[PDB]
Amino acid sequence: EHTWPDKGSLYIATTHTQARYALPGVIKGFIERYPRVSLHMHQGSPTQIAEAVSKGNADFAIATEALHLYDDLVMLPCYHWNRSIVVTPDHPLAATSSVTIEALAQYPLVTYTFGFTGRSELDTAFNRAGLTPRIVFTATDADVIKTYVRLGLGVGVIASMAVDPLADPDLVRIDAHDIFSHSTTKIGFRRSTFLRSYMYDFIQRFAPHLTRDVVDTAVALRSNEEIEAMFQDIKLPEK
Template identity: 35%
Template sequence: MKLQQLRYVVEIVRQGNHLSAAAEALNTSQPGVSRQIQLLEQELGFDIFVRTRNRIVDLTEPGRRVLEIAQRMLGDMSALRSLKEEISMPRGGTLTVGVTHTLARYVLPPAVEKFLNAHPDVHLILRRGDPEEICKMVEAGEADFSIGAQTMNQFPELVTLPCFELPRSIIAKTGHPILDAPELTLADVAAQRMIAYDTHYSGQWQVMNVFGHARLPVNVVLSAIDGDVCKSYVAMGLGVAIMTAVAYDPERDIGIGMRDASKLFPPSIINLTLKPNGNMRPYMFDFIALVAPQLTPKVVKTAMKSRLARAA
């Protein structure tokens, strides 16, 4: 049994059971990944994956336990590497943070600047993905922690702490009637052509739930995963967008305007997510405190210990 085989199991699940995508992410060949999984299953004596016509479609029940163990072992290996850095480089090291585009582009730059000035010997890596992808990075030991919007699915093996909330707004081309309507209603917004985030991004599923509960159909003409892309098409007059207010910059976003929509839609809740058994170095707590001052080392450590106690 090889650790690399367990890494393949985790990556296949992370890629939605697509062998080719997993192989690409692991910089190896699809036949090689398939062969290693088969060897692991032969050694264990049971199937890890459910297959239909030689295609992986799901995990078996024993496979789910294999996944949990694999994630834990890979996380422990990541903690060992972090410990090695801590001993060999007491003042420096590497910090990998999973982040969404909105946070990386509009929220984190001031914190990143302060952090790098305070910790010149630390190599900071920002790995971008949707809220669920960055949580999976933490699960797989590919990120020390993640900072992103609330996810549709739960990650019970991780510690999740709220950082802050981002209110939502309506973005439209300058001169659009919705920007000057005396009273903004949900029906007014639903009647517009919509430029929307993909539902996995920025808590967009929460926005769509509001329309669904009100039984108002929405005409989404274009979906994107990048706020800047959404604003480009809004500026062309192709539709309006519902975005977090922080994503709008009146000095840079020429040709578009913003209107507060916090009374119509819930805010985007931004969470810190990390492993309960992660090896947290002092500079990691410093980064967290720059983003969410209320999340002191004591608060984070207490949450981590509490999660471990529940799992015992």
């Protein structure tokens, strides 16, 4: 009843951050439309995620590993995203008129770890202002991080999508898009993967600008550089 009868396997290798905040909608949508597609899902670190799809278990990889050893696979820009700073309401940073990277910094921090969902600005955006802050905590998911900010171990820096005013009503969102450059989530797959219609539909459902035609031409280029050139004048979804 309003479903495609397409039969086939779809194996995704993705990160926590992706699996938790960016993927659920799509997946629920997808699996409802394709009851004959065996959707398998495997979470993990950028290198294994690179490894899995590369040679050669999973069909797609979904991650902010704009990082390398990715050349084998066709990488496609999906969206940008940045970070919010979260604190307990009783924090000095709460009652502050737009904080700076130096105004941060004076504090002990609970961030992500490198490399795993873009802390690849943190430190490398800190040494930039010649700064080195106390990182009392590095983790891989925001929910752990959030709960340790509730403890008061330090100030947290997480993806803006990882704050949910509903889910997180004991924290203060402070947007830091000014403070840190955005991160790009891409989607990979090796050239030799035959692209199935459900796959295009999935790509499309996850990144609206990635239509069959866009996709095809992006893979017609011999480079991920060339691809990112293709979109350098396309405004991505900003998440």
